[PDB]
Design a protein around this ligand. Structure first.
Ligand SMILES: [Mn+2]
Ligand SMILES: [Mn+2]
Ligand SMILES: [Mn+2]
Ligand SMILES: [Mn+2]
Ligand SMILES: [Mn+2]
Ligand SMILES: [Mn+2]
Ligand SMILES: [Mn+2]
Ligand SMILES: [Mn+2]
Ligand SMILES: [Mn+2]
Ligand SMILES: [Mn+2]
Lengths: 382, 377, 376, 376, 382
């Protein structure tokens, strides 16, 4: 708990030394638990942290998009992410991709379209705290409404790239005109004005009312919505914060992505736990955190995170997420699976015979008496 | 005619010795569309460019990942049997799907509960043998020629597990003990496999059926594809068999497509998996759109294998005077596509116009009903 | 008493220094059947050829893909516990299946809904712990020795996540905050893992049961394999536990096979997945038929691991005077085989004759009923 | 003072919580050049974003392929030693190259012929230790801080072979037999490694020299880079050490580049191998041209690692008011580049004009002499 | 040094327990340091031991061949080995392969042939203790002389198989007769008696004198011999045994294999060392040994070896080879490199300032005074 000097130094008790070479003081201040790790860290652990601020931002007329992929964070082979921004009325061009796409609306609102394997369309407006999920290969679009929009997209393969989606106008620009004309029963003259290259993101007038955009068709309505109002659900409320979970059990279409939004008050922490199903991918919406990843065989490494950072926890590794700042800590947890699952350290030990736990920990009834059989994902410090 | 790789002011005459016959077969590759761009893997291979294994009773030649490396998940054998000839009892790690192009044959299969299924397959019929289940084929009075598709690209037709090869490589004492016979009783077992061999015609199917205490299989291993009602559009027909109707065909979804002269399988993609193609008859071109401004056109004719990687945009245009007939194969439990026309038809017209820089005259032509094969006007 | 690699006019005496004891254990490898041919990967490894991790309270040794590289999907630990000794609370990514060979033990497991299951396991019983669910083992009054099988070949017994190792590598401030205690209250936590440690015998199972707000688990994590009715053939018995009867065992299908002297697990293959084997007792040979004229025979005895890649033909012949007892393990939700005899029995007899160049005298012996273990 | 991702009519303000400090460090990434295009792998990682291993006597932090995956062939440790502190005698498979940034240290190495080399290294000096040869570092009176580069990206600083770790994991009977001593004589050996440990300052270099029957090493393992005459261009200086002058440095070619304010390492590429970079001081941007219309610009400052894959076009522009100082590292036996200016200068002027759609006014400025660092 | 019972048990002090399940007592007796490892072992280490007795032996008219490859010992990706036996006069059929081949003649003697890239032939007799080396792709044969022969072949790729060499008669059997006839200017009738399948190993009459077999040609003699008399060289003689080294510096053709024969008296040991160049592959000719492989980061595992065993030491790992029996221990060390190199622990420390070594080891002048600046590869116990 000893605090750093204005110029922090990698010193812990009698270990470490001052930095003698030119250095990045600003980044060191953001990474206090990396410049000075806990004494309990040990061994080689892959990097589990990357900042969107350290990525190239693709700027277009109407917004921007930047990405963190396996080429930035190689531990995350199964999940990649885009931070995308749209100005009011601007359109993310009709497109599809091999990966399924999950999204969280951080700021503003947007209208999405999607058409399914049966030719059925779903059109809906998404606001702050809402999600969408587009299954692999189904074509979709996003158009920001009057406030603009900024959102996080997560794709279920780490090798994604935002520059490799299949765009409507790119497909047509690379199809012979004779074939397009034959496809639609029109003349080549009727399609002479098709774009010669993709748009990707483009400015446009605001759309009208949602009701006026709904398209009915001969194949009927989709069975399940492609959007979900996460923040309208009743959260799991612990002493130190709240957890909102959306997986395929409640957000029915979201078959390959399970998700949670976690809020952690100052002085609180997402408790010690692990996931018995799959890897965790993280996005930090706001606040400041540290997390130690316990990797087995005496290996553990602590990382720091703040707004704009991606984190990762490989399958079954022990972890916690501690708020280390004065404001709420808000982050997303993402899993490539059909459901969310964790094992809580506290609940695990609480559900075992007390003398058996005592025999393991070399602690007494004073400790086992504090264990809780109810899981409290976010705990508050006393 | 002597074609040249010239398109407008681009290209030049060929100055070196060349293969004129192949150039005539590949007009859209010697002279690609101006709209092609970028590196795309090869998506075409001819069975005529493969080694044909000849045996007493027929032949078998294959296109695998060693010929067409983009196709890692699917491989194929073109097999021919003379009347009465037998493809020896065998099994393999891969599931096997088949389309009977010519003639007819009797198949056998035994399942993991010891139940046998024996049936005759004719032109336009399919079979599907799940992985590891043992089977045989015997051509009937007119012979048979058929296409086999295996759900792994690394297959080889020379590495199936053959009944007689197994026995030839098992100790005689073990074979004798296995069946409760003497070693002398099995002395005449073959020393090497047969693979394909000549034989007299079998009797009636009814007389070959074997009844047993474990009863009949719950689902048939054959399917009469051409007896089903096809999806009919202006330019042709589509017949689909996947696990929703051909119940056993869990890892292969299939379609037979017929395209009249002047018609085209419309612009679409598959949101589920890669497409593997076999061209039964006719002449076609297809452009594969691979994202990020990459697209490449290929030509196909009878005897060719094609491929479309997962989610790539494509169409199949008849470029000849005869019907174009081809198979589409997918390693999945169902067939699925997205039609470009239907997609745009199901969106607000002004939104589509904003994308395409076209007006209501174009959006008025879009159809909310999918028409897989369209006819030119 | 000195075997030589000679078969008729093939082979020769060994002229260099040699391992006569191992040669005597591997008669069908020093002198293979004439019917073997071609390159086949090794399908045989002995636990006696592995490093044994010794701890206060027992031991653990393993056969993994680093010992037997054909077995990429399955690995195994032979673990021994003295009376009362504890295999420390731990978890791992891999699912774990177990067979109790000797003695008995108490297991605990807690699931992802916070529900605990505690049960006693005796000889012939199994357990199955799904991936990532935390568990422990404690031997009862006789001690215990058992075989664990993990559904990835790259496992290692030294890489499990141990309760005390986790806590030893977590900041004390974080542990204290997690439980609402002071750092002083947790100062006595161990500085390193225990793994296996000695302990007094546990009390009655009834006294260990913990009730909780989330109720009981829906399916048990133990199974009394030898209490089931086996498939009894002429030459032995087969007991099967897969996800159809041992409901939790979703990624492991298993069978215990007993083969009398003079009997043999018949010629068959598996149309679903690879087979992993552990030889509990007795002596066997097996030929693996790998297609395209490739076949190789291997010898096995107590303590050996074997393997049969997906769809390869095989049999398991007792070559000794005592019963042969072995486990068959498959990474799948069910057991399945195709029997050579039953296959041919279910085809037209003249069609079989046309293949085999044998007559009705042979096809008349074929049986439409499957008999997994046959007697000579 | 609040930058925004806006370039003319493209982009927009950031509406979500953001990292303004990092955005200010990366102006050409928040607002890239209009000329960037396409997907390019990340080519930039900060040592400040790594876990620092702290020991009594100093620290070590690393950037490896697990942090910067484009760099598969090279990894790096920033190591700091207090006065007299010792980096424990050790070896590793990888060859090690080093640049002394601050202070000074004594190194030892023994070769495979039993010959020892001991030398003092000061600011601007290098060392190179071939793969597998054992060595140590001990800081002198001012302490030391230096950059180590290893010729495999999968390195880890926690995986080196340490003298005391080896002995702690060797049977005492074997150690005793090895040296002809009793087990009692070696009872005080450490039970675990030291890695970095505090120690009194060493004596004179002359007093440490050890003579032996195998003579002196043929080539020195240290090099006084900054004592060499640099290539001096209009905008800065370049000092090169590769196997042609630093004879032992067979797998690492290196250069120290200084770039004045308003200057730039010119447009060039390497026809031999990938470039790995460490930024000692100052602030830079670099565009990596990856072919087929792909290009991405990155920002660097003190403490950053950069990378340029084999043959990709690049330049390094000083974007600050202070000198820009960086290292270029190549896994090869020599340094080589092709300069864009010199290339075009050596071709017929009308041929260059036909390519560039520019006239004699442009081709007249081309120079047949290579100037690695140019001044605006 | 405590000895096992006739039925050994995995017990070390108060650690371990008796074996309660059916077990392989004979193998346990062969592996005393695996049933009861040193207390100093720790962590996961790949298997480094495999017995030729655990391999399928290919029997032919004239001899046998069995192999240990990466399919048996997966740590050894770069080296594989065949133990081959020939009866008097029997021929290992003319053949070639992609891998280079190195050989040690353990028993008997043989005549070898080889033809090089220039059409030059080399024919020579090899006896006990002699080597050969055949570069990749050059065709060769072996024919045993009057005592027969048994030898160890080592190939410089672990994926080798003895059943995959290119055999003269197999090539011809799979070439169209018209092509063979055209190749040699003969009729198809003249070649009708060519074999229909390969021979591999076949019986034959003893050859005549070597002098009568030598073939001269227009391209002259080879520049360097393909055989080497290892045991005729003066060995490095230490107190506890001898070392004979053949690498490309003395056996000039042996460009990809460096080799050593090591003899270790009872009570002696190949000292603690490592190799700074490459992995070590081992074959145990006679005797009984143990070796601990030190793999870094606190990882170490001990293995036992006896006649007929293959061992392995990955690049740069610390090791020693201790004789644990009453007879001499004789083994081969093989390296895929153009030279042999090691670093001796003793010599390393002997060449450093004594106080510096003392500061590392927490030992005094009593220890540093015993260090030797001369390398003694095999040391004898006092
Ligand atoms: Mn999208
Ligand atoms: Mn979590
Ligand atoms: Mn088949
Ligand atoms: Mn299609
Ligand atoms: Mn376990
Ligand atoms: Mn089986
Ligand atoms: Mn070093
Ligand atoms: Mn450069
Ligand atoms: Mn050879
Ligand atoms: Mn060695």
């Amino acid at each position: 708990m000893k605090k750093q000097n204005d110029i922090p130094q990698p010193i812990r008790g009698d270990k470490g030394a001052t930095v003698k070479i030119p250095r990045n003081i600003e980044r060191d201040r953001q990474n206090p638990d990396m410049l000075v790790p806990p004494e309990t860290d040990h061994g080689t652990v892959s990097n589990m942290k990357f900042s969107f601020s350290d990525t190239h931002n693709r700027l277009e007329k109407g917004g921007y998009a930047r990405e963190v992929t396996v080429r930035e964070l190689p531990i995350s082979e199964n999940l990649a992410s885009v931070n995308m921004r749209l100005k009011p009325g601007a359109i993310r061009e009709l497109h599809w991709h091999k990966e399924a796409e999950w999204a969280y609306m951080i700021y503003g609102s947007a209208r999405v379209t999607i058409v399914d394997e049966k030719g059925r369309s779903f059109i809906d407006d998404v606001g702050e705290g809402d999600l969408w999920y587009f299954p692999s290969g189904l074509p979709h679009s996003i158009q920001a409404l009057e406030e603009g929009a900024e959102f996080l997209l997560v794709f279920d393969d780490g090798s994604f790239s935002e520059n490799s989606t299949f765009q409507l106008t790119d497909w047509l620009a690379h199809t012979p005109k004779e074939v397009i004309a034959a496809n639609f029963g029109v003349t080549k003259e009727e399609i002479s004005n098709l774009p010669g290259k993709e748009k990707y993101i483009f400015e446009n007038q605001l759309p009208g009312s949602l009701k006026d955009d709904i398209v009915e068709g001969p194949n009927g309505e989709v069975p399940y919505p492609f959007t979900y109002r996460l923040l309208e659900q009743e959260p799991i409320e612990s002493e130190g914060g709240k957890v909102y979970i959306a997986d395929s059990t409640n957000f029915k279409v979201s078959k390959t992505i399970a998700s949670a939004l976690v809020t952690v008050e100052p002085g609180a922490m997402r408790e010690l736990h692990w996931h018995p199903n799959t890897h965790e991918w993280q996005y930090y919406i706001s606040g400041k955190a540290r997390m130690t990843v316990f990797a087995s065989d005496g290996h553990a490494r602590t990382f720091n995170y703040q707004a704009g950072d991606v984190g990762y926890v490989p399958f079954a590794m022990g972890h916690y997420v501690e708020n280390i700042g004065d404001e709420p800590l808000v982050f997303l947890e993402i899993f490539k699976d059909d459901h969310y699952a964790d094992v809580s350290l506290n609940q695990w030990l609480a559900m075992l015979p007390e003398t058996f736990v005592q025999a393991h920990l070399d602690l007494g009834k004073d400790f086992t008496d504090v264990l809780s059989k109810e899981k409290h994902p976010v705990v508050k410090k006393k």
